[PDB]
Design an enzyme around this catalytic site. Structure first.
Site, PDB file in Angstrom:
ATOM      1  CB  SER A 165       2.599   2.379   6.324  1.00  0.00           C
ATOM      2  OG  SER A 165       0.678   2.560   6.863  1.00  0.00           O
ATOM      3  N   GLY A 166       5.247   0.426   6.365  1.00  0.00           N
ATOM      4  CA  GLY A 166       5.848   0.156   5.443  1.00  0.00           C
ATOM      5  C   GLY A 166       7.352  -0.476   6.785  1.00  0.00           C
TER       6      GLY A 166
ATOM      7  CD  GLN B 108      -1.650   9.572   7.799  1.00  0.00           C
ATOM      8  OE1 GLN B 108      -3.167   9.341   8.783  1.00  0.00           O
ATOM      9  NE2 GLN B 108      -1.780   9.708   7.217  1.00  0.00           N
ATOM     10  N   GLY B 109       2.887   7.123   8.410  1.00  0.00           N
ATOM     11  CA  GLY B 109       4.248   7.234   8.769  1.00  0.00           C
ATOM     12  C   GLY B 109       4.731   6.429   9.269  1.00  0.00           C
TER      13      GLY B 109
ATOM     14  CG  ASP C 192       0.577  -3.731   2.819  1.00  0.00           C
ATOM     15  OD1 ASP C 192       0.975  -3.819   1.764  1.00  0.00           O
ATOM     16  OD2 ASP C 192       0.193  -3.365   3.741  1.00  0.00           O
TER      17      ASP C 192
ATOM     18  CB  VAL D  62      18.477  17.434   9.732  1.00  0.00           C
ATOM     19  CG1 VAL D  62      20.378  18.513   9.641  1.00  0.00           C
ATOM     20  CG2 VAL D  62      17.641  18.964   9.961  1.00  0.00           C
TER      21      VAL D  62
ATOM     22  CD  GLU E 247      17.834  10.867   6.041  1.00  0.00           C
ATOM     23  OE1 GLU E 247      17.580  11.662   4.524  1.00  0.00           O
ATOM     24  OE2 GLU E 247      17.888  11.628   7.046  1.00  0.00           O
TER      25      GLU E 247
ATOM     26  CD  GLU F   4      21.814  11.798   6.278  1.00  0.00           C
ATOM     27  OE1 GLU F   4      22.591  12.467   5.707  1.00  0.00           O
ATOM     28  OE2 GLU F   4      21.206  13.274   7.041  1.00  0.00           O
TER      29      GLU F   4
ATOM     30  CB  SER G 196       4.043   1.917  13.856  1.00  0.00           C
ATOM     31  OG  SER G 196       2.133   0.458  14.028  1.00  0.00           O
TER      32      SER G 196
ATOM     33  CG  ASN H  12      16.259  16.170  11.870  1.00  0.00           C
ATOM     34  OD1 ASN H  12      15.876  15.873  10.665  1.00  0.00           O
ATOM     35  ND2 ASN H  12      16.299  17.075  12.929  1.00  0.00           N
TER      36      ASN H  12
ATOM     37  CG  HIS I 240      -0.557   0.891   3.201  1.00  0.00           C
ATOM     38  ND1 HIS I 240      -0.106  -0.283   3.894  1.00  0.00           N
ATOM     39  CD2 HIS I 240      -0.526   1.845   2.817  1.00  0.00           C
ATOM     40  CE1 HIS I 240       0.042   0.172   4.218  1.00  0.00           C
ATOM     41  NE2 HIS I 240      -0.264   1.435   4.018  1.00  0.00           N
TER      42      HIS I 240
HETATM   43  N1  LIG Z   1      -2.372   1.587  14.258  1.00  0.00           N
HETATM   44  C1  LIG Z   1      -1.424   1.567  13.386  1.00  0.00           C
HETATM   45  N2  LIG Z   1      -0.383   0.661  13.565  1.00  0.00           N
HETATM   46  C2  LIG Z   1      -0.701   2.197  12.038  1.00  0.00           C
HETATM   47  C3  LIG Z   1       0.304   2.011  11.297  1.00  0.00           C
HETATM   48  C4  LIG Z   1       0.611   2.068  10.154  1.00  0.00           C
HETATM   49  C5  LIG Z   1      -0.387   2.989   9.634  1.00  0.00           C
HETATM   50  N3  LIG Z   1      -0.251   3.674   7.784  1.00  0.00           N
HETATM   51  C6  LIG Z   1      -1.673   4.354   8.134  1.00  0.00           C
HETATM   52  C7  LIG Z   1      -2.360   4.384   7.186  1.00  0.00           C
HETATM   53  C8  LIG Z   1      -2.864   5.477   7.141  1.00  0.00           C
HETATM   54  C9  LIG Z   1      -3.515   6.281   5.991  1.00  0.00           C
HETATM   55  C10 LIG Z   1      -2.603   5.840   4.720  1.00  0.00           C
HETATM   56  C11 LIG Z   1      -1.576   4.843   4.584  1.00  0.00           C
HETATM   57  C12 LIG Z   1      -1.511   4.561   5.486  1.00  0.00           C
HETATM   58  O1  LIG Z   1      -0.001   3.759   5.595  1.00  0.00           O
HETATM   59  N4  LIG Z   1      -2.746   4.106   9.176  1.00  0.00           N
HETATM   60  C13 LIG Z   1      -1.308   2.795   9.919  1.00  0.00           C
HETATM   61  C14 LIG Z   1      -2.010   2.912  11.353  1.00  0.00           C
HETATM   62 CA   LIG Z   2      18.984  13.578   7.795  1.00  0.00          CA
END
Ligand SMILES: NC(=[NH2+])c1ccc2nc(-c3ccccc3O)[nH]c2c1
Ligand SMILES: [Ca+2]
Length: 223
Positions: free
Chosen positions: A177-178, A174-175, A84, A57, A52, A62, A172, A54, A40
């Site tokens: 993911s992956g 948003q941000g 996924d 910066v 990385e 890096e 964990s 920061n 996703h």
């Molecule tokens: N609660 C959790 N463990 C979690 C983890 C990663 C996520 N990633 C998202 C996410 C939301 C919107 C678009 C991409 C995303 O990866 N929500 C997430 C929630």
């Molecule tokens: Ca940096």
């Protein structure tokens, strides 16, 4: 990451930031030219940023390398997030040392109770948003498949596992993911999804990497 701690610069050397003009997902370096992330997180024009701490910066460790190709899992379903996982090949090989190193793939699947390390540059608040510039870490256990299916009835497949605290407060977000879920020096999960972040009885759900080792190895061997 919500309720985590600051990792410290380059203490998670396999962590990568996927950038398309800004950080949008995490990933894990598995060898000098391949990164594994969540399907996703796919998009075109991805630059992989290694070494990385920061992300706003340039501190000196890096390595910014563009992706030559991305391969999303053949059975990825974006509506259920089953399978996924995706592979990203780098245009050139990264230079590995102590601060930029790959993480090993697992030979066995981890069991519930295992403590793991989850990291990322994702949101640190459960209500509201505050994105950190340096890498955050969280140590969390893998939960039983029974607790996981009970928290998300009808949504957990054999390619997913839950990890976290049912009490909430730590997860964990948003941000993140992956990114990686490492247990005993092996990559066991990929941050995939959750219902909000750090909410009571809604733990994070992760892609179960042990089920994809043959696909990862065969793909790398032929591309
Ligand atoms: N609660 C959790 N463990 C979690 C983890 C990663 C996520 N990633 C998202 C996410 C939301 C919107 C678009 C991409 C995303 O990866 N929500 C997430 C929630
Ligand atoms: Ca940096």
């Amino acid at each position: 990451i919500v309720g985590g701690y600051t990792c410290g610069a380059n203490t998670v050397p396999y962590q990568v930031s996927l950038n398309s003009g800004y950080h949008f997902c995490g990933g894990s370096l598995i060898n000098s030219q391949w990164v594994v992330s969540a399907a996703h997180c796919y998009k075109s024009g991805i630059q992989v940023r290694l070494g990385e701490d920061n992300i706003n910066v340039v501190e000196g460790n890096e390595q910014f390398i563009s992706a030559s190709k991305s391969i999303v899992h053949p059975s990825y379903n974006s509506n259920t997030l089953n399978n996924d996982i995706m592979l990203i090949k780098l245009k050139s090989a990264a230079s590995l040392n102590s601060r930029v190193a790959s993480i090993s793939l697992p030979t066995s699947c981890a069991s519930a109770g295992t403590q793991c390390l989850i990291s990322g540059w994702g949101n640190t608040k459960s209500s509201g948003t505050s994105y950190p510039d340096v890498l955050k870490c969280l140590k969390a256990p893998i939960l039983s498949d029974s607790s996981c299916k009970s928290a998300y009835p009808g949504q957990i497949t054999s390619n997913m596992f839950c990890a976290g605290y049912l009490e909430g407060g730590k997860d964990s977000c948003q941000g993140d993911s992956g990114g990686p879920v490492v247990c005993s020096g092996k990559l066991q999960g990929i941050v995939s999804w959750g219902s909000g972040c750090a909410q009571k009885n809604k733990p994070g759900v992760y892609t179960k990497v042990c089920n994809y080792v043959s696909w990862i190895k065969q793909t790398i061997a032929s591309n």
